Amino acid sequence: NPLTHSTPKNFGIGQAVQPKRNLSRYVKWPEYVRVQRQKKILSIRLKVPPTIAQFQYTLDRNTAAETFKLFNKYRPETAAEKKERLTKEAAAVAEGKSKQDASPKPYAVKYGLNHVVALIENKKAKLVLIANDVDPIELVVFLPALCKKMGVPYAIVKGKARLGTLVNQKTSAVAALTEVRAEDEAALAKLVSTIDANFADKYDEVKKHWGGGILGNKAQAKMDKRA
Amino acid sequence: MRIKKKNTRGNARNFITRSQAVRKLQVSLADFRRLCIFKGIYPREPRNKKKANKGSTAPTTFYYAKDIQYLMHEPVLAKFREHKTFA
Amino acid sequence: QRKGAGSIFTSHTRLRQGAAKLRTLDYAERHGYIRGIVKQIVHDSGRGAPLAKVVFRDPYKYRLREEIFIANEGVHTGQFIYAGKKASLNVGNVLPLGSVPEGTIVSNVEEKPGDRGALARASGNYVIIIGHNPDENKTRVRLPSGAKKVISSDARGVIGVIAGGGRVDKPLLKAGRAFHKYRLKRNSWPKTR
Amino acid sequence: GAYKYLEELQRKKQSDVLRFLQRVRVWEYRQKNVIHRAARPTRPDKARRLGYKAKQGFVIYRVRVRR
Amino acid sequence: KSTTSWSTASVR
RNA sequence: UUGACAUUGUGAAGAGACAUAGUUUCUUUACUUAUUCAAUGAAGCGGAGCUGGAAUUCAUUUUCCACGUUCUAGCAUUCAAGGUCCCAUUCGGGGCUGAUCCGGGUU
RNA sequence: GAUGGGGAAGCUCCGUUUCAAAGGCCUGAUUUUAUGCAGGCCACCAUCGAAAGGGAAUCCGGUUAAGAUUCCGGAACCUGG
């Protein structure tokens, strides 16, 4: 190692050119990025009423996975299957017999907002899943109260695209299980009992307690050094 | 009449670099390499390597800008983009 | 009441050197010091004090980055100027108000820390520091007019008095010398009662 | 349908659940330009009874005017 | 001839 | 130049009204998220840890500068040389460190 | 004097780098997942505005009713490839 020397630099405060560092804290982001971030923050910092933030109490990981294991067995019928059953009934309406009564009863979820609000107050819905992120929140802000009123097993789920997956839309904002097959009665019963024990009971506080009076980072360190 | 910008015409215009070529075709390095074989378009050595690279001697591959103007049309390129969309 | 629109009551800006301003208070200026060389002292059309071309280096890129001070009486080409919090006490250095002992004299002092110099900027003038206030850091000064003001202790100011002192002793003696004096400031001469 | 509960709740404009959203959204809009495009109606009950219909060719704009 | 803005160059 | 209503929100404390069980009004003192002002080709901010220390300890940590730059009209630029651990050893390339860590605030 | 923006019921007004996602270069068997882009670097303002300001390069001789540092003869020079 005879020719190779050691010329360390002194990045100092007076003699060097400061090396490249990760300055991603001070990037001047675009306006839309700044706005979405600051809306998130301004919502974390303010006291919110108790009907908002009555969300943010969703099904935990295991129970959401278990709920979707069952709800995915009832995906509504798609375009190709629709045309195929239409071709079958097309054959049978005149040849053997069908009054739209050759193919059996269909069982699938119910996913319209007007439809599910009209399915409650009947009352036939057996379990209601309500997405927790609707941007105009006042669309769903009143569903838990009506559900508890009419005595329906509601549960609030994390994600609306997640709901839309089992309906074959992009977002769906509500879903309902109204009637299930024969092999799934025990599954649905145990699931509604689980939702009872985990959502109805774990959250007797939610009715009170305006949430969101959280301080920043610098303000918090200021108060915590003061007191 | 408009003295004329010592680094435009001649060797500097006859050839184009590999990075310039790919940036112009707007595909990728792998797709460029496959298309340059399907055609096939080979690399060239200029008679003034300093007069082409505008001042320098850095190992580089040059490609006959007219060859790549003919390569830009190439109905295979759109098939490649269609496969990307299908993916 | 006609000078407001500004058709012919602007300023004459062709021969002016530029805005005389201190450096932008960056990391080194607020944590340590930094050095520069004074390279030429020049006339500026319209002022009464001579300007000074100080050349610093760029801490963040391989470059040079030259400023324009207002020369204090005593500096000379080839001098090293120091700027920051850890600067010494010599004529020419720019220091923060909190780090100069009472009784001292500064010039071109800032008003709100980071605005680059408001008070004591004309030829000959200086401003005395009369005391501090460490708890709730503040500082008391004495402006040229005789006012006793109080400002923050992180506002900078360059040590000394402004050059060119004495400009108002020699009479003008002539309408022509007032003509040549105000020819380069604005359109105010001759006057009407 | 849920529109009866939507349009009834939209009538209590001084309740807390609404006068908090008023303050969130009036901040949010004050950053975008004076006139911009809205991705979707923000009173989908009030637009429907004025003539809106959720099919191609119906557009919603948002405009801010001085007082 | 050429009737459009972009043609396919037809010629090596 | 003054008074009023609206934009206008979060506490603490003091007194009144529920007539010794918690909802409302005047008072002072704090807050920061609204709104206001200025700068930066949003570069080193927060109080606060951590190693360094001194300083001084009344039980054990609280306040200070971060502490790589001051005889001189020189120079400072190529993912930074070194140290160390792998490749597939070939023209060399990768990893940590040199350059402490955290943060839903550019100052 | 356009754009980014902001005023005005409106013809239109302010302002010129401003509070904007304001483009243009390098390398790549980037390595494993096998027909889908990877790693980087640099920063500033459209445009108009002078036949007296700035600025690449030409001379002599002859020639017509009326043209010439321009046409003819000769001898040169600048810019780009």
CSV table of C-alpha atoms in Angstrom, one decimal, chain B residues 32-65:
chain,number,residue,atom,x,y,z
B,32,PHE,CA,-33.8,-0.5,-27.8
B,33,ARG,CA,-31.3,-3.3,-27.7
B,34,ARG,CA,-33.9,-5.8,-29.1
B,35,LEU,CA,-35.1,-3.5,-31.8
B,36,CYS,CA,-31.6,-2.7,-32.9
B,37,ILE,CA,-31.1,-6.4,-33.5
B,38,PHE,CA,-34.4,-7.0,-35.3
B,39,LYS,CA,-33.5,-4.4,-37.9
B,40,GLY,CA,-30.5,-4.5,-37.4
B,41,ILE,CA,-28.8,-1.2,-36.7
B,42,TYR,CA,-25.1,-1.4,-35.9
B,43,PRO,CA,-22.7,1.0,-34.2
B,44,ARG,CA,-20.3,3.2,-36.1
B,45,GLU,CA,-16.9,4.7,-35.4
B,46,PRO,CA,-16.6,8.4,-36.4
B,47,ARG,CA,-13.5,9.8,-38.2
B,48,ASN,CA,-13.3,12.6,-35.6
B,49,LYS,CA,-14.2,11.3,-32.2
B,50,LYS,CA,-13.4,14.7,-30.7
B,51,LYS,CA,-15.5,16.5,-33.3
B,52,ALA,CA,-18.5,14.3,-32.6
B,53,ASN,CA,-18.4,14.3,-28.8
B,54,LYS,CA,-18.1,18.1,-28.9
B,55,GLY,CA,-14.8,18.1,-27.0
B,56,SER,CA,-14.0,14.8,-25.5
B,57,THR,CA,-12.6,11.3,-25.7
B,58,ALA,CA,-15.0,9.1,-23.7
B,59,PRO,CA,-15.8,5.5,-24.8
B,60,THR,CA,-19.2,5.8,-26.5
B,61,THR,CA,-21.4,4.2,-29.2
B,62,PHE,CA,-22.6,6.2,-32.2
B,63,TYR,CA,-25.5,5.2,-34.4
B,64,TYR,CA,-26.1,7.0,-37.7
B,65,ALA,CA,-29.0,9.4,-36.9
